[PDB]
Design a binder for this molecule. Structure first.
Ligand SMILES: *[C@@H]1O[C@H](CO)[C@@H](O[C@@H]2O[C@H](CO)[C@@H](O[C@@H]3O[C@H](CO[C@H]4O[C@H](CO)[C@@H](O)[C@H](O)[C@@H]4O)[C@@H](O)[C@H](O)[C@@H]3O)[C@H](O)[C@H]2NC(C)=O)[C@H](O)[C@H]1NC(C)=O
Ligand SMILES: *[C@@H]1O[C@H](CO)[C@@H](O[C@@H]2O[C@H](CO)[C@@H](O[C@@H]3O[C@H](CO[C@H]4O[C@H](CO)[C@@H](O)[C@H](O)[C@@H]4O)[C@@H](O)[C@H](O)[C@@H]3O)[C@H](O)[C@H]2NC(C)=O)[C@H](O)[C@H]1NC(C)=O
Ligand SMILES: *[C@@H]1O[C@H](CO)[C@@H](O[C@@H]2O[C@H](CO)[C@@H](O[C@@H]3O[C@H](CO[C@H]4O[C@H](CO)[C@@H](O)[C@H](O)[C@@H]4O)[C@@H](O)[C@H](O)[C@@H]3O)[C@H](O)[C@H]2NC(C)=O)[C@H](O)[C@H]1NC(C)=O
Ligand SMILES: CC/C(=C(\c1ccccc1)c1ccc(OCCN(C)C)cc1)c1cccc(NS(=O)(=O)N[C@@H]2CCOC2)c1
Ligand SMILES: CC/C(=C(\c1ccccc1)c1ccc(OCCN(C)C)cc1)c1cccc(NS(=O)(=O)N[C@@H]2CCOC2)c1
Ligand SMILES: CC/C(=C(\c1ccccc1)c1ccc(OCCN(C)C)cc1)c1cccc(NS(=O)(=O)N[C@@H]2CCOC2)c1
Ligand SMILES: *[C@@H]1O[C@H](CO)[C@@H](O)[C@H](O)[C@H]1NC(C)=O
Ligand SMILES: *[C@@H]1O[C@H](CO)[C@@H](O)[C@H](O)[C@H]1NC(C)=O
Ligand SMILES: *[C@@H]1O[C@H](CO)[C@@H](O)[C@H](O)[C@H]1NC(C)=O
Ligand SMILES: *[C@@H]1O[C@H](CO)[C@@H](O)[C@H](O)[C@H]1NC(C)=O
Ligand SMILES: *[C@@H]1O[C@H](CO)[C@@H](O)[C@H](O)[C@H]1NC(C)=O
Ligand SMILES: *[C@@H]1O[C@H](CO)[C@@H](O)[C@H](O)[C@H]1NC(C)=O
Ligand SMILES: *[C@@H]1O[C@H](CO)[C@@H](O)[C@H](O)[C@H]1NC(C)=O
Ligand SMILES: *[C@@H]1O[C@H](CO)[C@@H](O)[C@H](O)[C@H]1NC(C)=O
Ligand SMILES: *[C@@H]1O[C@H](CO)[C@@H](O)[C@H](O)[C@H]1NC(C)=O
Ligand SMILES: *[C@@H]1O[C@H](CO)[C@@H](O)[C@H](O)[C@H]1NC(C)=O
Ligand SMILES: *[C@@H]1O[C@H](CO)[C@@H](O)[C@H](O)[C@H]1NC(C)=O
Ligand SMILES: *[C@@H]1O[C@H](CO)[C@@H](O)[C@H](O)[C@H]1NC(C)=O
Lengths: 120, 246, 120, 246, 120, 246
């Protein structure tokens, strides 16, 4: 489905904060005893509304809430960290969970580069 | 199932992994992102009287927490310390590992009392309370949060200044709630929904810079007479201990 | 291996309870503040002993206990939620963890639909 | 490794992911299920004296918890509140997020005392104690559980009524344990293994409906004389403060 | 990259302890009430420095620390158990996350055994 | 990203999953292993005065825990019980499920006091404190740990004796720290970095076997005069209550 922003307003600019997991260190800064406190581990970025991405993003989060809340109701984990991992597994199962029939719409195998090798 | 955001034909679309064509490439989990978005960006009223009406107490529902990797710099956050009239705490202490929201321009710290007819305080519109990379369905005592919602995406393959604004409340979380902006422990201003954070800061500066603070040991309460949009797109003092400020 | 029920009795009927994760909401019921309490989130179903499924299921759970307990002894997680996710990963690794040799018994690729395209 | 249930040739079989042929299709994690099955379904004796002998105290073994997604409506559940003779609690309080079993026809609540020679109470046959979608190796204080076991499967691609039955115990978890079915705080019946939940309920009704409750402030204890299978397949009162009931 | 041991010393022998997850039981030892205490669940082994494995292993753990610490700084989980599972998923995504082009360096499909079947 | 150990051409190499050729086969998660390696194996000084200088207190940094499946038998472990001079504890109690390191030849138990200018004690070189299959960035009170580091690998497809050695410390975690090896509650030896665990054990035996223990109720402190490598590759008593032992 396409995302239709149905909000009274949309801030078209996204000033965001996140953490750098790779966080290339400068000397001993990676050592927790010498490194930043909890308040200084964040990087920042600015992202404009190219492709309408920001306004779509706000609408997408609004529409995710119902399914997310129902998922959280049904789970017994106090803190859920595995939603994205379970979606990566579901991605692979959709494509590789059964027998792959070459030239089938549900099999993501392209024989084109090698189908010329035989006919040459 | 939980929706998933993927860019197709230069537009953001909702399409779960079962609805992906072979052209879509997922080469590592790094392309998967969970993000938090602030209700401010949708144009909701962020003044304390408006925000608090969106929260209510409820029992029988276990709290739940979900994490997100990146958030939005907020203009307005909230930090609640509410007790019942007999003095018992209304909100649970923050669980281990749950810290406040990391980027707030104004933190509206509210101390007050209310009936608190419920074990936990939830969001009446179903939104989340955003903490440090953790989103909860409930409010924790004395912990800075931003109202918000979470999205999940497949990616295609100026310093920080924070100011605390303190308030007092009576009859919190009810149909009859009163608030007072706090200038010090004995000087207060009756608060109205129209009062922006910048107006409150300039009001606080004006009261200090020429001497309207309580010069007694009693509770001095002012009032701004009625004669006096989105954050990203933008006097005489008399005493009648109530008072007035034209 | 086949499952042989070695129990003194077998209730052939399974009156079960579970939760609806998709839980298609009716209005505002998905909002935790308005939704059901912890006691009212369950759906129910009834399942009879077709194919001997119920009696086999009781025997299967009985036989799972030893391996499950030994797994729980060896783990340091207080609450284990990831057994099924780790089995989905193991499913994919068994088939796609190495080079897939077409027409091998261990490679789940069927070239039949396209092997006619070449010979036609 | 942990066994896995898959249907082949119209029969349930144990076969782990490494023993699956290419014909077997796993298109999403939704096909994977963890379920809980009640020991009642295997024909075990579910009366309080029989069930308690299957549980014992032990030290040096850390408790463990595993989750399951779906369970079976039980006829018999148990809720233990046991203290040592000096009054210290024997069972740990339920950890956060662990609630009782959601579907019990009869909850056998047992309050009593015993030596409690161990830090935690385990199942002597190696089964689990089933809570709300969580299975534990140990018993938690005051939390309703069902004895059971967990299975893991690959799937191929009347209201709820609960009645509480209260008991008193002395010398719990020993070779010499005595139980009393409780009618009120001062009226009791000596309990025997033969007494079904329905018999106990009808006994309680009979005692109330014609006046056999203790009309003093002393402890009145009755006795059912000996002259008086599976749940899914189915008088004169004198006083000798002991008594009898033919 | 190759592992170069830059430590003042290297104990070339590895006397290790671990747990047996399969832990083939002897009678009732698998039942937690009858089984070993927390102190007696360990097996042991001895491993010598064949292929320089032990000295490389000590150097590898030393060099893992910086990335591991930066990962732990950026995470909000108090106890992290899923690093190896997430690397198994990343292993499969690298190979099967897109369309597999046969005879491409990035597609791990060997058609050799069947490419003779056509030409015969 | 987090490095990964894979054997290629008969040598251990670091290569993450994105740098693996099709020849590399990963058939199950069992091939993936997380292991803990002891700093002793790198030749670090394991005497109490040297080890403690590698640890320091710090605030503002949340502790973190990562698990590992297999560890190395250690010769030296440490168990700290440190209080501030006013008696408040310096180290947090061990969280639920965190037990001591399972294989230690010598456990150096240290009880003492210090300023403790920080909420948690970290490793100054960035190493980890290894507990039972759990590695932490911080020290827990009274819990035996080994200093170590964690590796992650792709695999290609004599009883246990432990001896406790007790020490007293003043001014712990500072530039001026003093230690005393403890023989009993009233007999002590001034400790030096040169003193190996075996030397301390033989010193303790010698003092007992011929009667150098304090025969009063006062604190008797001895001293070993200066006239008196890796673990895997290897007298007259006078009193001057200080003393000497040539
Ligand atoms: C996604 O965005 C939606 C649109 O902004 C959010 O819808 C909001 O839903 C809440 C309840 O969950 C509403 O609050 C209640 O609304 C009704 C009255 O309707 C309102 O109608 C107009 C709309 O602007 C307004 O002017 C009126 O004053 C009413 O408030 C009553 O039940 C209550 O009084 C209460 O206010 C919001 O009004 C509604 N917003 C809008 C703009 O319609 C939705 O919650 C978002 N999803 C999330 C956060 O998960
Ligand atoms: C899977 O189902 C099995 C069969 O129901 C369960 O076996 C049970 O195992 C427990 C111990 O774990 C036994 O209890 C002990 O048994 C022996 C005496 O043997 C019994 O022999 C017959 C069998 O019915 C019975 O009539 C006797 O009275 C004995 O009880 C002694 O060590 C103890 O007295 C104690 O009772 C059960 O008897 C046994 N059941 C059966 C029917 O054999 C097994 O535990 C299940 N697996 C699980 C729950 O993980
Ligand atoms: C991986 O192994 C490396 C080599 O063993 C470890 O390097 C160690 O790093 C710590 C700090 O993290 C150093 O301790 C500090 O070092 C300097 C002074 O340098 C030292 O130089 C020589 C080296 O032997 C020594 O003789 C000197 O006395 C100095 O100590 C100062 O900042 C401090 O005084 C403090 O001692 C270690 O010296 C250093 N070891 C070596 C052998 O260079 C590295 O930490 C390991 N990575 C981990 C554990 O994650
Ligand atoms: C939409 C903004 C965003 C967010 C975001 C943040 C907050 C709220 C809503 C959306 C985002 C940023 C970082 C994230 O996680 C990093 C740490 N992770 C290792 C745990 C997650 C989401 C983001 C996403 C991807 C890449 C970059 N930067 S870019 O310069 O390449 N521009 C690219 C060019 C095409 O679209 C963006 C920024
Ligand atoms: C065997 C019963 C069962 C159980 C079960 C429950 C309790 C104890 C033992 C077994 C089951 C039900 C729901 C589950 O999870 C749903 C929530 N999840 C999103 C987290 C898991 C197991 C179940 C399984 C699959 C589907 C359906 N229904 S059906 O009408 O299609 N009949 C189909 C036709 C072929 O075999 C069943 C029911
Ligand atoms: C390097 C030692 C080692 C370790 C290790 C242990 C401690 C510290 C550093 C490395 C190891 C042992 C067991 C592990 O986990 C088992 C429990 N798991 C089910 C949770 C993990 C790592 C280990 C690894 C694999 C197999 C075996 N034995 S072997 O006889 O086949 N020799 C094979 C022949 C080729 O290289 C070894 C031992
Ligand atoms: C709050 O007071 C108003 C006064 O107009 C009344 O209409 C409303 O019903 C009250 N709310 C509750 C929950 O009693
Ligand atoms: C104002 O009141 C708060 C809350 O009781 C207190 O912590 C603070 O010290 C007071 N400040 C002054 C200046 O009295
Ligand atoms: C009010 O103004 C005074 C004087 O400048 C300042 O110290 C104080 O922090 C201000 N208060 C707020 C809430 O901004
Ligand atoms: C004293 O307080 C009053 C209000 O009660 C205010 O109007 C007045 O300016 C103050 N006077 C001085 C000298 O600060
Ligand atoms: C319990 O008492 C019986 C009496 O027959 C005795 O045989 C049995 O050994 C006792 N059990 C224990 C554990 O002492
Ligand atoms: C019966 O005893 C229980 C347990 O002490 C108590 O909570 C309850 O109020 C009593 N009921 C009556 C009717 O006295
Ligand atoms: C016993 O019967 C009385 C009278 O009907 C009823 O109030 C009470 O709940 C019954 N007790 C039980 C345990 O069923
Ligand atoms: C009083 O209690 C006795 C038992 O002690 C019972 O037999 C008798 O029926 C009761 N009497 C009345 C009037 O309830
Ligand atoms: C500790 O004392 C020494 C004495 O030489 C001094 O050089 C050093 O600076 C002191 N350390 C601190 C942290 O004050
Ligand atoms: C030695 O002191 C410790 C610590 O106070 C105490 O527990 C122990 O009982 C003492 N031992 C003797 C023999 O006095
Ligand atoms: C010291 O020696 C005595 C006598 O053999 C023994 O009891 C004690 O355990 C020893 N202490 C240590 C720390 O080895
Ligand atoms: C008594 O203690 C002293 C040290 O104060 C020691 O030298 C002496 O041998 C001890 N005497 C006996 C008889 O144990």
């Amino acid at each position: 489905e396409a995302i239709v922003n149905a909000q009274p307003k949309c801030n078209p600019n996204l000033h965001y904060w996140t953490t750098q997991d790779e966080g290339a260190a400068i000397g001993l800064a990676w050592i927790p005893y010498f490194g930043p406190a909890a308040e200084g581990i964040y990087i920042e970025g600015l992202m404009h509304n190219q492709d309408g991405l920001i306004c779509g993003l706000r609408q997408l989060a609004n529409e995710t809430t119902q399914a997310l809340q129902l998922f959280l109701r049904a789970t017994t984990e106090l803190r859920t960290f595995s939603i994205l991992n379970r979606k990566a597994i579901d991605f692979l199962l959709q494509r590789w969970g059964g027998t792959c029939h070459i030239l089938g719409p549900d099999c993501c195998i392209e024989p084109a580069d090698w189908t010329k090798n035989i006919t040459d | 199932s939980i929706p998933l955001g993927v860019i197709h034909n230069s537009a953001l679309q909702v399409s779960d992994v079962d609805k992906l064509v072979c052209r879509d490439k997922l080469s590592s989990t790094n392309q998967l992102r969970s993000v938090g978005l602030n209700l401010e960006g949708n144009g909701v009223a962020t003044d304390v009287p408006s925000a608090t009406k969106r929260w209510g107490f409820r029992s029988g529902v276990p709290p739940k927490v979900v994490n997100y990797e990146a958030g939005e710099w907020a203009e307005n956050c909230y930090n609640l310390e509410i007790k019942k009239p007999d003095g018992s705490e209304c909100l649970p202490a923050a669980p281990d590992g749950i810290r406040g929201f990391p980027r707030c321009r104004y933190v509206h710290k509210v101390s007050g009392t209310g009936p608190c007819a419920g074990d936990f305080a939830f969001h009446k519109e179903g939104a989340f309370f955003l903490y440090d990379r953790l989103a909860s369905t409930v409010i924790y005592r004395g912990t800075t949060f931003a109202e918000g919602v979470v999205a999940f995406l497949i990616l295609p393959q100026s310093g920080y200044y924070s100011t605390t604004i303190r308030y007092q409340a009576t009859g919190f979380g009810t149909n009859e709630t009163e608030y007072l902006f706090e200038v010090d422990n004995l000087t207060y201003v009756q608060l109205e929904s129209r009062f922006t954070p910048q107006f409150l800061l300039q009001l606080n500066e004006t009261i200090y810079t020429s001497g309207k603070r309580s010069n007694t040991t009693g509770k001095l309460i002012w009032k701004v007479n009625p004669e006096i949009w989105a954050f990203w797109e933008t006097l005489s003092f008399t005493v009648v201990e109530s008072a007035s400020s034209g």
